[PDB]
Amino acid sequence: MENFQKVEKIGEGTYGVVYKARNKLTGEVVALKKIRPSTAIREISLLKELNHPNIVKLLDVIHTENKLYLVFEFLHQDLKKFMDASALTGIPLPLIKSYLFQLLQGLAFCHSHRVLHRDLKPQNLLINTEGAIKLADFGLARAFGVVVTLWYRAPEILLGCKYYSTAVDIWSLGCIFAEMVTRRALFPGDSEIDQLFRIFRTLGTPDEVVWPGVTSMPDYKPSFPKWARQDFSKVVPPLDEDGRSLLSQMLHYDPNKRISAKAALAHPFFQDVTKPVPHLRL
Ligand SMILES: Nc1nc(Nc2ccc(S(N)(=O)=O)cc2)sc1C(=O)Nc1cc(F)cc(F)c1
Question: Which residues bind ATP?
Answer without folding.
Answer: 10-18, 33, 73-75, 78, 121-124, 137
